[PDB]
C-alpha cells in the first residue's frame, strides 16, 4: 500500500531521482542513500515524560526519532 502510493507519486513526478526514488530503491532492497533526517516513514510517538525532557532539548529528539517541528 505504501509502496503503491510512493510508486504512483514517483511516476507522475516524472520518475526523477530523489527521495521518492530512493525509498523505492530501499524497498526493493538493492541500494540505499540515507538522508540526514527522519521522515514520515519511521516516527515513534514519545511519552509525556519525553515531552518534559525535551522542553528545547534536540539531542533526545535525535536520540529517539520522535516528532519534530
Amino acid at each position: 500500500k505504501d509502496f503503491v502510493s510512493t510508486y504512483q507519486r514517483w511516476q507522475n513526478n516524472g520518475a526523477p531521482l530523489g527521495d521518492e526514488a530512493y525509498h523505492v530503491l530501499e524497498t526493493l532492497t538493492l541500494g540505499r542513500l540515507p538522508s540526514a533526517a527522519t521522515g514520515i516513514g519511521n516516527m515513534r510517538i514519545a511519552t509525556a515524560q519525553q515531552r518534559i525532557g525535551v522542553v528545547w532539548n534536540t539531542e533526545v529528539i535525535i536520540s529517539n526519532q520522535l516528532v519534530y517541528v
Binding site: A46, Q50, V54, L66, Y68, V69
Partner: peptide
C-alpha cells in the same frame, strides 16, 4: 476548540496521542 488545536501545534512543540485522538474525533 480549533484555536486550542492550533496552539498545541506551534513550532518547537511535539504532539501526543491525545492531540491525534482529538483530531480524529473531529469528524
Amino acid at each position: 476548540s480549533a484555536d486550542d488545536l492550533k496552539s498545541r501545534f506551534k513550532e518547537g512543540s511535539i504532539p501526543l496521542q491525545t492531540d491525534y485522538a482529538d483530531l480524529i474525533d473531529i469528524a
